Design an enzyme around this catalytic site. Structure first.
Site, PDB file in Angstrom:
ATOM      1  N   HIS A 174       9.387   8.343  11.087  1.00 60.50           N
ATOM      2  CA  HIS A 174       7.956   7.919  10.343  1.00 60.50           C
ATOM      3  C   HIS A 174       6.697   8.764  11.077  1.00 60.50           C
ATOM      4  O   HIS A 174       6.084   8.733  12.291  1.00 60.50           O
ATOM      5  CB  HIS A 174       7.072   6.792  10.434  1.00 60.50           C
ATOM      6  CG  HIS A 174       5.962   6.615   9.317  1.00 60.50           C
ATOM      7  ND1 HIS A 174       5.359   5.159   9.528  1.00 60.50           N
ATOM      8  CD2 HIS A 174       5.013   7.606   8.541  1.00 60.50           C
ATOM      9  CE1 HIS A 174       4.679   5.615   8.019  1.00 60.50           C
ATOM     10  NE2 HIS A 174       3.859   6.929   8.408  1.00 60.50           N
ATOM     11  N   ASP A 211      10.197  -6.403  -3.589  1.00 62.39           N
ATOM     12  CA  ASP A 211      10.497  -5.697  -2.360  1.00 62.39           C
ATOM     13  C   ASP A 211      10.875  -7.116  -2.139  1.00 62.39           C
ATOM     14  O   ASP A 211      11.105  -7.796  -0.990  1.00 62.39           O
ATOM     15  CB  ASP A 211       9.306  -4.832  -1.544  1.00 62.39           C
ATOM     16  CG  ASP A 211       9.483  -4.637  -0.692  1.00 62.39           C
ATOM     17  OD1 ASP A 211      10.320  -5.525   0.179  1.00 62.39           O
ATOM     18  OD2 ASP A 211       8.537  -5.252   0.297  1.00 62.39           O
ATOM     19  N   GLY A 230       1.105  -0.826   0.649  1.00 67.83           N
ATOM     20  CA  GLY A 230       0.382  -0.046  -0.352  1.00 67.83           C
ATOM     21  C   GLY A 230       1.113   0.937   0.042  1.00 67.83           C
ATOM     22  O   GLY A 230       0.532   1.948  -0.749  1.00 67.83           O
ATOM     23  N   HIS A 243       6.976  25.240  13.225  1.00 70.14           N
ATOM     24  CA  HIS A 243       8.224  26.293  13.097  1.00 70.14           C
ATOM     25  C   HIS A 243       9.282  25.486  14.037  1.00 70.14           C
ATOM     26  O   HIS A 243       8.955  24.759  15.069  1.00 70.14           O
ATOM     27  CB  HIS A 243       7.750  27.436  13.615  1.00 70.14           C
ATOM     28  CG  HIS A 243       6.958  27.836  14.165  1.00 70.14           C
ATOM     29  ND1 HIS A 243       7.862  28.044  15.812  1.00 70.14           N
ATOM     30  CD2 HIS A 243       6.157  27.795  15.461  1.00 70.14           C
ATOM     31  CE1 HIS A 243       7.056  28.077  17.244  1.00 70.14           C
ATOM     32  NE2 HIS A 243       5.926  27.573  16.577  1.00 70.14           N
TER      33      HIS A 243
END
Ligand SMILES: CNc1nc(CCc2ccccc2)nc2sc(C(=O)O)c(C)c12
Ligand SMILES: CNc1nc(CCc2ccccc2)nc2sc(C(=O)O)c(C)c12
Ligand SMILES: CNc1nc(CCc2ccccc2)nc2sc(C(=O)O)c(C)c12
EC number: 2.3.1.203
Lengths: 192, 192, 192
Positions: C131, C35, C13, C122
């Site tokens: 992740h 993969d 996915g 910021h």
């Protein structure tokens, strides 16, 4: 093509918001039908949309209006980003609000509401007449059953399934499968 | 029209972010005023903005700067989507960050901060000098009182009201009315 | 410049989603490498991307592919809004999904995934091979260590630091520093 005008059925807050999306698509005018002017099958066959938030009631109207022969279109805001391999059922009463994202190979069934800034990740299936509320997010490969309601800012972990007619509370984080219907609240979401 | 230059008062992180929004609007240059160069009423009458996050301090400055005769403009990023029937008080020190959505007939009062990716649904009222933080979301018909602070990723269920000078914690989900001020945290948010 | 074609390594996915972002950038074609076709250093030197979600595995591949001499590019969707003073490591395997916002002087290190609608405020620093999942939000001046995972719809209060190799649960709200690694869940997030 789309007609120049569109019927918005429902005159409450949800309807005003659908009026904005329809105009964003370029409809020149929204004719509100009272839901409480009144509807009968004889009206000029403009495009049609059911702007009622409640899933059960929206569905009963949808059933009616279709049988009376109107095209219940989708209202999709231009700022929604929808993968080319995602499937959104055409002319199926689906509302997609601003800044919604639907990613690769997700499926949106008829009557669904995808509200503002919600996210449908890759490979999800959102079952018909579901309402994915403001900011609610489905991780990849999530199955949302028919007539489900995912509350504002809720989310569902990936590869989970939520049973038909379930409610996920506002803010709730669903981390396990739920094969039987229920109301799930909290982080982690628990049967309530 | 807008002046070619704009004063950004506050030189911390919030000010750098306001500099980005002002440039996105097309201001050619941001002149930072120290908040800690220094301010006095005699400066060339460029447009003005108070880039201070704290609601009480931002308000006391706003009171000052106005009395000294500067136009405190709104800084609205181009990617903010604002319904034509929503009302945002003009020249009223309001910051609207990227990907904010404000829907039909919502009202934003003076001095409010609507931070990145926040959502103000239809018919809401956000009271003056409130700060709706990053990702925070108000469902439809919510009343946020003056000087409220809604923390990052918090949300408020629809038709709720939050009393002036209240704080809704980061991540908190407010599900009931709160007529007296407080600090509310968790899912559901509880008085802390 | 970018090559006309790009290798997407990973066919699950996450890879389909990276295919969408690469096309949005204007790559004419994505060649998936299994993969599980197969990889060896002799392939035509097209641009390269590792579309594997797991941080440890993505890193070991990244180490491999670089040593074999491919340019591992960044895949950045056009709808991502990135401050001019933010730094995103170039040709460093970074994925930035739709409607991500990265604000003034934030730093994104190599191998990071910034997933759909996430927000990096910021001055943040997102450590390499982190992740930041769907809808996850870092308030200003947050330090995310290497190989961290911030779950869907999680958030981190400002000026906090999260230790290398930590996991912040889906929906969790981190309100305190965490100098030693762990798994943190809930609102407020607690060591699990
Ligand atoms: C009773 N109405 C609701 N109830 C709850 C669940 C409240 C709850 C209860 C206990 C713990 C956590 C949350 N979530 C939501 S979201 C939502 C929306 O427009 O997104 C509504 C109208 C509700
Ligand atoms: C002490 N500062 C804060 N505290 C809390 C509430 C922390 C809390 C406490 C107990 C339970 C849950 C959350 N939320 C937030 S949001 C936030 C922002 O920039 O969005 C800040 C600066 C805070
Ligand atoms: C086991 N996998 C996960 N676990 C948790 C934490 C679940 C939890 C546990 C206890 C309390 C709250 C939440 N969050 C997340 S977010 C997430 C994603 O794609 O965003 C995943 C795959 C997970």
């Amino acid at each position: 093509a789309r007609t120049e005008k569109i019927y918005i059925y429902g005159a409450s807050g949800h309807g005003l918001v659908c009026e904005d999306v329809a105009k964003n698509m370029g409809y020149k005018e929204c004719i509100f039908l009272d839901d409480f002017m009144k509807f009968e099958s004889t009206l000029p066959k403009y495009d049609f949309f059911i702007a009622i938030g409640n899933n059960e009631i929206r569905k009963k109207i949808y059933q009616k209006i279709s049988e009376n022969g109107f095209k219940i279109v989708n209202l999709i805001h231009k700022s929604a980003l929808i993968s080319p391999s995602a499937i959104v059922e055409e002319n199926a009463g689906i509302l997609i609000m601003p800044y919604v994202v639907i990613n690769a190979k997700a499926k949106i069934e008829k009557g669904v509401i995808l509200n503002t800034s919600s996210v449908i990740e890759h490979e999800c299936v959102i079952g018909e007449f579901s309402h994915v509320s403001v900011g609610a997010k489905c991780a990849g490969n999530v199955k949302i059953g028919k007539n489900c309601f995912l509350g504002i800012n809720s989310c569902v972990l990936p590869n989970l399934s939520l049973a038909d007619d379930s409610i996920l509370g506002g803010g709730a984080t669903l981390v396990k499968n739920q094969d039987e219907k229920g109301v799930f609240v909290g982080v982690p979401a628990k049967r309530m």
